[PDB]
Amino acid sequence: ENLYFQGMSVAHENARRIISDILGKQNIERVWFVGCGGSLTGFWPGKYFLDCEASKLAVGYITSNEFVHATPKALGKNSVVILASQQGNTAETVAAARVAREKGAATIGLVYQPDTPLCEYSDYIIEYQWARYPETVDPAQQKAAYSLWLALEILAQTEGYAQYDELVSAFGRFSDVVHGAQRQVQEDAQRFAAEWKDEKVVYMMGSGPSFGAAHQESICILLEMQWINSASIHSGEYFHGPFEITEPGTPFILLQSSGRTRPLDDRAIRFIERYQGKLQLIDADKLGIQDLSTDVGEYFCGLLHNCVLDVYNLALATARNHPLTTRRYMWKVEY
Amino acid sequence: MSVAHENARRIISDILGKQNIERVWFVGCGGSLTGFWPGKYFLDCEASKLAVGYITSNEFVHATPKALGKNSVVILASTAETVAAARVAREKGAATIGLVYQPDTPLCEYSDYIIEYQWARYPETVDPAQQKAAYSLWLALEILAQTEGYAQYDELVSAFGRFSDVVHGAQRQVQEDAQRFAAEWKDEKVVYMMGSGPSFGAAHQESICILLEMQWINSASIHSGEYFHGPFEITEPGTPFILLQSSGRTRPLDDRAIRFIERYQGKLQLIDADKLGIQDLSTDVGEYFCGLLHNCVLDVYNLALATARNHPLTTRRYMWKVEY
Numbered sequence: 001e002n003l004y005f006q007g008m009s010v011a012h013e014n015a016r017r018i019i020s021d022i023l024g025k026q027n028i029e030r031v032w033f034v035g036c037g038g039s040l041t042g043f044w045p046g047k048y049f050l051d052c053e054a055s056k057l058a059v060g061y062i063t064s065n066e067f068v069h070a071t072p073k074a075l076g077k078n079s080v081v082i083l084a085s086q087q088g089n090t091a092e093t094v095a096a097a098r099v100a101r102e103k104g105a106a107t108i109g110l111v112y113q114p115d116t117p118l119c120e121y122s123d124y125i126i127e128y129q130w131a132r133y134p135e136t137v138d139p140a141q142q143k144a145a146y147s148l149w150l151a152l153e154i155l156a157q158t159e160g161y162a163q164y165d166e167l168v169s170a171f172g173r174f175s176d177v178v179h180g181a182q183r184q185v186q187e188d189a190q191r192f193a194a195e196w197k198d199e200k201v202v203y204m205m206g207s208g209p210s211f212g213a214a215h216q217e218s219i220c221i222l223l224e225m226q227w228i229n230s231a232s233i234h235s236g237e238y239f240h241g242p243f244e245i246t247e248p249g250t251p252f253i254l255l256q257s258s259g260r261t262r263p264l265d266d267r268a269i270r271f272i273e274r275y276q277g278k279l280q281l282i283d284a285d286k287l288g289i290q291d292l293s294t295d296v297g298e299y300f301c302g303l304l305h306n307c308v309l310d311v312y313n314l315a316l317a318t319a320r321n322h323p324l325t326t327r328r329y330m331w332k333v334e335y
Numbered sequence: 336m337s338v339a340h341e342n343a344r345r346i347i348s349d350i351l352g353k354q355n356i357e358r359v360w361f362v363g364c365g366g367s368l369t370g371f372w373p374g375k376y377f378l379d380c381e382a383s384k385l386a387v388g389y390i391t392s393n394e395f396v397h398a399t400p401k402a403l404g405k406n407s408v409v410i411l412a413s414t415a416e417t418v419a420a421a422r423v424a425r426e427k428g429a430a431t432i433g434l435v436y437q438p439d440t441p442l443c444e445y446s447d448y449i450i451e452y453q454w455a456r457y458p459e460t461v462d463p464a465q466q467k468a469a470y471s472l473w474l475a476l477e478i479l480a481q482t483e484g485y486a487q488y489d490e491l492v493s494a495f496g497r498f499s500d501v502v503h504g505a506q507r508q509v510q511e512d513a514q515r516f517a518a519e520w521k522d523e524k525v526v527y528m529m530g531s532g533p534s535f536g537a538a539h540q541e542s543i544c545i546l547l548e549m550q551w552i553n554s555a556s557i558h559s560g561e562y563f564h565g566p567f568e569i570t571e572p573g574t575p576f577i578l579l580q581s582s583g584r585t586r587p588l589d590d591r592a593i594r595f596i597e598r599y600q601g602k603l604q605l606i607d608a609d610k611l612g613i614q615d616l617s618t619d620v621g622e623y624f625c626g627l628l629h630n631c632v633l634d635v636y637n638l639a640l641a642t643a644r645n646h647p648l649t650t651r652r653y654m655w656k657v658e659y
Contacts, residue, residue: 037564051388055402058386063560070532070584074383092560201525201553208398218555224565229525231542231555236393236416239659240365241548244651260398271659329567335595
């Protein structure tokens with residue numbers, strides 16, 4: 001018999017070393033995901049995985065400055081606090097890492113820029129990859145991807161996870177699925193941009209693994225990068241107040257998921273179409289989630305939507321003559 | 336004792352005689368989920384060993400946490416999907432608490448304990464301590480007190496004793512401002528709700544259950560901390576924000592938001608719990624009552640707005656009218 005020796009994702013190996021090192025020094029009884037805006041919603045994939053799969057863990061998900069100011073008494077020696085910041089200096093995320101460390105928690109800091117202030121209070125540092133679409137990097141090494149890698153490792157090294165190998169090889173297929181999906185949506189994205197360029201209010205929707213993506217699109221793209229009024233509505237929540245807003249032409253972008261919460265999404269689709277809402281459907285299952293894994297591909301829906309949306313976002317920004325880098329406040333005034 | 340207090344005490348002692356309480360989930364839809372924010376926030380702040388979940392009913396049904404089990408309590412309020420969530424909870428071995436307005440209603444069937452809360456349509460009022468969202472805090476107080484212990488138990492129970500008075504004082508206080516608000520806000524097409532810490536659930540609730548549902552005004556909720564990481568770029572003169580400002584620890588997130596909104600001439604309606612009598616509740620634990628106060632204070636602004644807009648709050652085009 002010939003012996004086979006496998007390799008490992010950069011993100012897989014980083015995640016795995018960090019969590020082993022931490023377990024050698026404490027228990028992992030509680031995790032917090034802590035950050036601001038996109039640097040909090042980037043943790044949704046891991047949050048969702050653990051909420052679904054971990055039986056022993058208590059999992060938190062909190063905006064940095066709230067964590068700093070109203071610190072949970074549950075934070076301590078056997079907690080892990082995972083923080084993200086792009087340029088590594090969001091003062092409240094740095095203070096969150098400081099407070100976590102003062103409380104005795106292990107801190108994992110995700111940064112794009114190394115030697116940035118978040119690093120000072122990060123026991124472990126991950127330099128995730130990032131580029132501005134149409135420039136690309138390895139999707140398995142992007143900020144949101146690391147939420148799922150770290151989640152996988154926390155679960156596997158504390159409770160075990162029968163589908164570990166399945167998810168690791170799903171992640172090995174992820175770059176091909178992302179590239180195939182982005183290519184597949186070019187035409188639709190163009191048609192979207194031309195037809196949606198004049199909307200002043202857009203509602204983002206999703207459920208389960210895709211809900212973070214929906215919220216992120218809402219707060220980080222539509223409000224932040226386009227100045228379009230927006231809310232995110234959980235597909236399940238839609239029918240308990242929000243849907244009363246719906247009339248012919250009310251714009252909804254639904255980020256539909258594979259797997260268990262899909263019927264939530266299908267329920268919304270039927271209703272939005274029955275009442276002639278302006279619906280842009282982006283369906284993970286049509287864009288090759290089934291190619292990742294028939295078992296655990298539900299957990300990659302948010303990550304896939306984040307990537308596929310880059311295409312629609314550029315198309316819309318060009319149609320609206322509003323570059324995604326437009327700001328009137330951020331990086332411009334003090335606040 | 337308050338009847339709400341004795342109800343919560345009796346329920347949680349009974350459960351603890353039969354299982355442990357290692358995990359709590361708050362499960363509901365819309366305002367029957369936001370109603371749990373007061374207890375959720377309290378537990379997130381005060382409980383060191385409890386795992387606390389907060390989940391819309393049909394997602395709890397379709398993607399049930401593996402963590403759900405014999406030493407879990409699932410607390411629900413009322414909706415076939417919340418009934419189904421109670422069924423799933425019980426089927427998994429979790430104890431179930433159902434908050435209901437009317438008895439014999441479908442959620443009762445899968446609820447090990449049923450709490451008939453108090454509700455009335457403003458200006459008709461009811462005991463604030465027996466309202467749906469109040470019970471979230473009562474139940475949370477007792478989960479924590481009967482398991483880990485709570486050093487401010489009596490200070491919070493006496494706070495709760497004074498809460499009816501603070502609510503009535505606050506509702507009287509805002510009468511004139513509410514009329515001014517309605518006159519000035521009746522033509523707005525988009526309203527952002529804002530809050531932090533204990534008042535965030537109340538902000539979200541106004542947004543989804545009042546502005547969208549009962550007024551057909553476009554709206555999103557924004558956490559006061561999240562504002563400055565994307566949402567704030569929507570701000571320009573006249574952008575409508577209703578900030579439910581909190582007392583206590585997160586107040587500085589709200590002050591930061593107020594300085595910014597005012598500097599770029601947002602149309603700001605400020606409703607401050609510390610101006611409406613949270614200082615009279617306690618000095619220690621009063622912060623935990625801010626969401627509850629906001630819920631009540633907003634009833635006044637909501638009626639006034641509904642009147643100025645000739646849009647009754649009971650107006651619906653879909654709910655209780657079509658199938659969905």
